[PDB]
Ligand code: SRM
């Protein structure tokens with residue numbers, strides 16, 4: 001019985017999305033940008049290019065101005081499509097030189113109305129970009145060793161790596177090599193250009209890459225016999241049907257990582273479902289097959305050998321975000337700063353690149369939690385840096401809230417969203433800071449808040465202390481507005497799991513601060529000593545949670 005799987009012989013398209021990939025190599029659309037589209041403009045762009053093949057090059061069309069959630073749906077595309085683009089720049093590892101960061105700044109100030117926002121996958125995204133300047137931009141990014149290749153599309157998304165790869169004192173190893181090997185080997189190459197859906201990778205020495213929710217994850221663990229290598233995890237995801245990735249129970253050494261990554265992706269290519277668009281993510285295959293069959297197939301058909309068994313890394317009790325100052329293997333310091341919901345500007349990035357030059361620093365990393373850290377600051381030139389960054393509003397000593405808050409793009413730019421998230425976040429933070437500085441000392445433990453535009457969970461709705469899922473709501477049977485559902489007490493690391501939903505409960509855009517304030521206060525009210533938020537939630541009564 002057919003599910004669209006290549007490996008079972010069913011190579012026949014069953015989607016419009018699968019249909020468009022059978023029409024040449026999607027990535028081939030780059031000639032057409034430079035040759036045709038950047039020269040003729042938005043309206044020349046064939047619609048199967050604009051909506052399909054543009055994705056393989058980091059170009060999603062942004063939402064047209066002044067259409068609220070009322071208008072959100074597959075059937076309003078012509079209306080919702082603004083003649084501008086969100087261009088996503090691929091940063092495998094968050095890793096960047098100061099020259100590279102510089103370029104990202106000026107590209108934004110110049111081409112993207114100063115918009116630059118750090119994604120929770122270590123990328124930057126621009127908005128207000130026009131096709132005319134795409135060729136100029138590619139040309140420019142190349143100078144600094146950056147591309148947009150497969151930053152969107154049915155292909156491997158950015159590979160996450162630790163913001164502190166190679167300098168962290170706690171890391172099991174530095175797997176940067178493996179990342180760069182994967183990118184050098186495999187990005188832009190025909191073999192993995194066509195996958196049932198998107199494909200997300202995390203590789204790190206630390207559990208600081210939200211690994212449990214990636215399609216494939218490689219995580220430092222000491223093997224008692226074989227030494228520092230990587231633990232392999234597979235089948236994660238969070239959209240509208242969240243599933244934690246699971247241990248394959250294998251241990252992979254650094255050098256074999258890119259080989260084993262290619263294996264896994266290969267299994268996705270061939271056995272992944274291609275009938276339903278909503279059922280195409282690897283996770284669904286893993287759910288169906290079970291972990292053991294997966295490993296069986298993986299060894300027997302693609303690696304041609306068993307993967308050496310190995311232990312799980314010991315799950316951390318607290319997420320590792322790298323905000324703040326820390327000593328390096330260097331003998332130097334690194335600096336983690338927090339913007340609000342990843343929101344920086346073209347100006348900020350350049351202004352930052354310059355402060356780095358002042359410090360002698362040439363290494364910066366973006367963070368899987370929309371943050372950025374500067375590396376190799378010597379003690380001597382550190383305070384003059386921090387003050388330089390605080391000046392741009394990039395706080396290295398942020399508050400509880402500013403530090404542990406994410407938002408997606410939402411209805412500001414995103415054509416799929418029901419609510420405003422990012423701008424909303426720029427104001428909610430000060431409101432919470434001054435509203436709850438009151439209770440602040442009594443919180444010995446952080447509260448994480450993720451504001452999501454719609455159910456897609458781009459800012460990780462399910463795995464926050466307080467998670468907000470943007471749905472359309474009714475207001476006295478007069479008219480439908482924007483609003484959020486709450487998911488509470490979801491965490492990664494030790495005993496990972498998702499936040500609970502509440503029965504008949506909605507939070508309008510205005511009420512966000514009200515709800516947070518209340519449930520936080522009720523937390524402190526009913527909590528026990530040392531008890532984390534998430535722990536309370538599981539025993540808490542419905543009423544204290546509303
Ligand atoms: C920018 C970012 C949010 C952020 O502020 O961090 C983001 C924003 C978008 N995501 Fe994503 N996603 C981002 C991380 C994720 C994550 C989180 C993660 O990877 O940890 C998820 C959840 C995890 C997962 O994938 O399971 C996520 C699940 C989605 C979904 C759900 C897809 C699905 O599997 O069903 C969509 C829609 C889709 O693919 O059909 C999607 C679609 C989008 C689009 C392209 C909306 C669209 O299709 O038109 C958003 C960009 C619109 C815009 O104009 O900004 N994105 N999105 C993140 C981009 C990181 C990157 O560089 O790649």
Ligand code: SF4
Pocket residue numbers: 408409410411414415416417418421452453454455456457458459
């Ligand atoms: S979670 Fe939804 S609204 Fe937010 S950025 Fe993703 S697709 Fe857009």
Ligand SMILES: [Cl-]
Pocket residue numbers: none
């Ligand atoms: Cl995405």
